[PDB]
Design a binder for this molecule. Structure first.
Ligand SMILES: CC(C)[C@H](Nc1ncnc2[nH]c(-c3cnn(CC(=O)N(C)C)c3)cc12)c1ccc2c(c1)OCCO2
Length: 168
């Protein structure tokens, strides 16, 4: 478990790799995989759709029963549920969707959830169709997370831009 390999070390606790988070979860067998969730835990699109399909929809069935009784999460909040075949636990984290006018300042609160876990496999929060500046998201991660975080970014041009920008 937690067999991470091939990552660039950005800081003493933040690592990054150009990889699909689903393929990393299958290789690594992490204690925790982070999902780039939304408040009603509808696992479509982006990371969430890929993670749920890799569980053959088990993640969606569990998430629907959670939401039915507990209601939606808040932006910046999180929820631990089963990791199914991908991890021991899945930490569902809601970053702000700035393309839908949500508050970018809540991105810090979204990464603060990672500090409850010693080591995590995670995506870059609020990137992709959520619209945040990826360079900004990586800075908020580095400044906020104190535990060991292994970021999987599934886009070579974005990965190459993030690393170049970070190394300036
Ligand atoms: C910024 C981008 C690159 C990032 N996406 C990702 N980051 C890391 N691992 C990822 N895997 C996939 C994926 C999708 N489909 N598949 C199956 C596949 O390709 N097969 C051929 C079987 C794998 C996407 C992905 C991101 C991060 C956060 C976000 C966000 C997006 O969407 C909205 C919410 O927040």
């Amino acid at each position: 478990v937690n067999s991470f390999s091939g990552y660039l070390k950005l800081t003493d606790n933040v690592y990054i790799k150009n990889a699909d988070i689903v393929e990393e979860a299958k290789k690594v067998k992490p204690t925790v995989v982070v999902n780039a969730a939304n408040v009603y835990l509808k696992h479509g699109g982006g990371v969430a759709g890929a993670l749920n399909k890799a569980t053959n929809n088990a993640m969606q069935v569990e998430s629907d029963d959670y939401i039915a009784t507990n209601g939606p999460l808040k932006v910046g909040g999180s929820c631990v549920l089963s990791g199914h075949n991908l991890a021991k636990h899945c930490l569902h984290v809601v970053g702000p969707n700035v393309n839908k006018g949500e508050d970018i300042q809540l991105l810090k609160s979204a990464y603060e959830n990672f500090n409850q876990h010693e080591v995590l496999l995670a995506p870059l929060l609020s990137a992709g169709i959520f619209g945040a500046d990826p360079i900004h998201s990586l800075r908020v991660c580095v400044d906020t997370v104190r535990t060991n975080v292994y970021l999987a970014v599934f886009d070579k041009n974005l990965y190459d831009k993030l690393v170049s920008s970070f190394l300036e």
